Amino acid sequence: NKASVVANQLIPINTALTLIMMKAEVVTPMGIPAEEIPNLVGMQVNRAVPLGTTLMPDMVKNYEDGTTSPGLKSVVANQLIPINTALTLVMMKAEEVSPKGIPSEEISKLVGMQVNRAVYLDQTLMPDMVKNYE
Numbered sequence: 001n002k003a004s005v006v007a008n009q010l011i012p013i014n015t016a017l018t019l020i021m022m023k024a025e026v027v028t029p030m031g032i033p034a035e036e037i038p039n040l041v042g043m044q045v046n047r048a049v050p051l052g053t054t055l056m057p058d059m060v061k062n063y064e065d066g067t068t069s070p071g072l073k074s075v076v077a078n079q080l081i082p083i084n085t086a087l088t089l090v091m092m093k094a095e096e097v098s099p100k101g102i103p104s105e106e107i108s109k110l111v112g113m114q115v116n117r118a119v120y121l122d123q124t125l126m127p128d129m130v131k132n133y134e
Helices: none
Strands: 004-007 022-025 073-077 092-096
Antiparallel strands (some): 004 022
């Protein structure tokens, strides 16, 4: 019904979108609308986006706070962290997002733990990536 956020140009992998790249056109499929334009802008995609691609929640990891109640809030790396780096709650954001990798129940004991793999922008933390997880 309303205008959806569809990228006008083609975007590469892991790239923050801009105002010129984000176009509010009324087209399908209806992915994410332009309500959280300031929150969705500069989001990093998981793969290459073609031209005229609508905002899809399955292609973007943590695009914005679309979920209302937390409950199943999993830890997510809001910023990019290099391999083997003691990251703490500052860069870790445990919010309700999919998929549900590792919850924030033992984060207090792993605060400032060194990861064994490379971490990208807003990505969900998983037990398969961390080899020193409890």
